[PDB]
Each structure stands twice: as structure tokens, then as C-alpha cells.
Amino acid sequence: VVGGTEAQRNSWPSQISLQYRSGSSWAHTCGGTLIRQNWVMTAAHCVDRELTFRVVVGEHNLNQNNGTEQYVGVQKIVVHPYWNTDDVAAGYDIALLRLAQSVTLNSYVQLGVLPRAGTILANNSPCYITGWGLTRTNGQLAQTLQQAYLPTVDYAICSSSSYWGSTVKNSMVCAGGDGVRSGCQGDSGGPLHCLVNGQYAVHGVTSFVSRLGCNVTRKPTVFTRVSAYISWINNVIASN
């Protein structure tokens, strides 16, 4: 997260860290959202490479024991059937991970709230992006969870020529673009929490930013619109 601030230790309990094994150590690669005690929602591009993945819940500082973390392996990966690695702009950047075991819920580990199917947010809706991703374009990962206020930019505006143009679809949500705050590498797959009816709900899964850099004016961070995949999500969890 570029231009963010350190999040309170228990502000976003559904946030998870998706890590892969590198030799004899683990490395953070993406964010995600705990949606069931044994299911995690993340971006499909986070699991394109065939590596060994593990999920960490109740995490705050990546480099030190907080005494609240739970480490669980990934048993099965279900990527959306239409996902195409060579065309992230085509959408469908979403995947579900079945955990090897159910995690225990407490003040640091809670399920994320999903929006009702089809819900579209008005322009400039209040949302926050969270993650341990780069704090600057071509920078380094954050040690502690960061958050940044990223109001939404409706489809009409986001798909205009001055912004993303035809690169963005209605199955996506745009947020930010002020040239100061944005998601960045390492935030992928993470949540976009938006306040609706007094409750924070996860409306997006971080998908992509500009090739020119993370925080670029008129190039808001793009997220997979969760509300467009509710039926798919429910079908997978109830089936597997």
C-alpha cells in the first residue's frame, strides 16, 4: 500500500497473508480474505505459479511473533474457470482456497462480510485497502499491516479515456487514483473494505495497477468486483 498508515492491530480481522515456501523459509506474496473458517478468497493471479502455499491469519507484523497468528496449509485451490493468466484485463481474477483445517475465530480472526449479489457502489464511496504490499513503486514490503483510504471511482468514469478506458470492465471496481495512495505489488488478492449501511464489507479483491507505477494520477487501483461473483462463490463452497 502506497501512501498508507499503519492499521490498528484488530481493525481488519479477516485479512490474511498468503505465503509460499522459498527453500526453507516462507515469503509473503499476496493478501486474501477469510470468508469461511476453512475458505479464503484471493486473486487468481496469486496462485498462477505452482508453489507450496500456506495462509496466516491473525497476522499484523510479518517479521515477528505477535502471539496471535495461526498457520494453516492450503488443501485445494479453485480458480475461476474463465480466468486467463495472459489477460488480467479480461477479469475473473478470483480464486478460492480450501484450508487444510478450520481456523479458530477470535478477536484477531473473523470472517469477512460479503456484499449482496449485484451491489454497485456510488461514485466516491468510502473504502479502505489493506495489505503488506510495497509502500512505494519498486520499493519494499511493509512489515506491519497498512491501510489507505481509497474512495471508489464509478465505472462510467473509470472506463473513460482519461482513466483506464476499455481496460476496465463492469465486473471490476476502481478506487483511488489521486496519485498519492494506492495498492501495490504484494497487496494483490487482498480486500477493499467499503462502508455500507454502517458495516464494512469486502467489495473488491485487489487485481492490478498501472505498468507505469502503483500510485499514478487517473490510474486508480483495480479490483475484482466481489458482488459479481456471489453465486459462483456460494456454488463452490457448498459443493467442495
| Residue closer to Ca ion (CB basis): 10 or 61 | 61
Q: Restricting to residues 50-69, which ones interact with Ca ion according to CB under 5 A?
A: 61, 66
Return the residue nearest Ca ion (CB atom).
Answer: 66
93 an active-site residue? yes
Q: How far is the CB of 65 from Ca ion (least distance, A)?
A: 6
Q: Which helix (H) or strand (E) holds 233?
A: helix 230-239
187 an active-site residue? no
For the four alpha carbons of 149, 32, 119 and 200, in that order, the dihedral sign comes to: negative
Q: How far is the CB of 167 from Ca ion (least distance, A)?
A: 36
| Residue closer to Ca ion (CB basis): 59 or 187 | 59
6 has binding-site annotation = no
Query: What are residue 14's phi and psi, to 5 degrees?
Result: -95, -5
Residues 6+ apart with CB under 8 A from 126: 149, 151, 194, 195
50 has binding-site annotation = no
Q: How far apart are the first and last CA of the chain?
A: 33
Q: How far is the CB of 59 from Ca ion (least distance, A)?
A: 5
Residue in 93, 125, 159, 203 annotated catalytic: 93
What DSSP character marks residue 135?
S
188 an active-site residue? yes
Size of the site for Ca ion (CB under 5 A): 2
Q: How far is the CB of 184 from Ca ion (least distance, A)?
A: 21
Residue in 14, 17, 28, 45 annotated catalytic: 45
If binding is defined by CB under 5 A, does position 144 make contact with Ca ion?
A: no
Query: What are residue 26's phi and psi, to 5 degrees?
Result: -105, 145
- Total residues found in the chain within this entry: 240
170 has binding-site annotation = no
| Residue closer to Ca ion (CB basis): 7 or 205 | 7
For the four alpha carbons of 97, 98, 100 and 104, in that order, the dihedral sign comes to: positive
| Residue closer to Ca ion (CB basis): 19 or 207 | 19
E strand spans, the chain: 5-6, 15-22, 25-36, 39-42, 53-57, 70-79, 95-99, 127-131, 146-149, 152-153, 172-175, 191-196, 199-208, 221-225
66 has binding-site annotation = no
**Where is the binding site, in residues?**
59, 61, 64, 69
**Where is the binding site for Ca(2+), in residues?**
59, 61, 64, 69
Catalog residues that contact Ca ion under the rule CB under 5 A: 61, 66
Residues designated as active site: 45, 93, 188
